């Protein structure tokens, strides 16, 4: 690929693993990042959604638009990458 910035490269290395991301509406999604994009659209699988009141539900697949993601907690091994 073209030289996209290091945070986007680390996001694609995060595809193997579990990531936890919060959306601008406040819901926290934990799941296994199956595809990511350079606009940081995220596809999660085996997802658990946690609502802002602390309720939770399972979701088989979730697509989140990249500009609606606030942050992602990435796994630690990516610090080595």
């Amino acid at each position: 690929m073209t030289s996209v910035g290091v945070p986007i490269k680390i996001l694609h290395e995060a595809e193997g693993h579990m990531v936890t991301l919060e959306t601008v509406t406040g819901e926290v999604y934990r799941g296994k990042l199956s595809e990511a994009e350079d606009n940081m659209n995220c596809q999660l699988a085996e997802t658990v959604v946690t609502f802002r009141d602390g309720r939770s539900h399972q979701l088989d697949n979730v697509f989140i638009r990249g500009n609606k993601i606030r942050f992602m907690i990435l796994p630690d091994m990516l610090k080595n990458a």
């Binding site: 910035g5 945070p7 680390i10 993601i69 606030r70 942050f71 992602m72 907690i73 630690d76 610090k79």
Partner: protein, 87 residues
């Protein structure tokens, strides 16, 4: 500071305190950034105003949500050739 290459490479790995537009305070070792001002914080923690601390992992913050950031703490820290003479 940033983008000035001689200066930017020294401002990475500082422990920096990040303020977000929702009012959150994140703290972590700031060690990557992007032209969109995305930032990647290693060993991150969050402080929420009410103060309460929570431990996070490696946190990627999408740049759109940063208000500002400041230095919190230093990076972590730790001639040599001769032998011609004898004594």
């Amino acid at each position: 500071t940033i983008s000035k290459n001689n200066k930017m490479m020294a401002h990475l790995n500082y422990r920096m305190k990040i303020i977000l537009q929702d009012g959150r305070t994140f703290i972590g070792f700031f060690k990557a950034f992007d032209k969109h001002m995305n930032i990647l914080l290693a060993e991150c923690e969050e402080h929420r105003q009410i103060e309460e601390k929570r431990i996070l992992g490696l946190v990627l913050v999408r740049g759109e949500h940063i208000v500002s950031m400041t230095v919190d703490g230093p990076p972590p820290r730790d001639g040599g050739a001769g032998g011609v003479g004898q004594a």
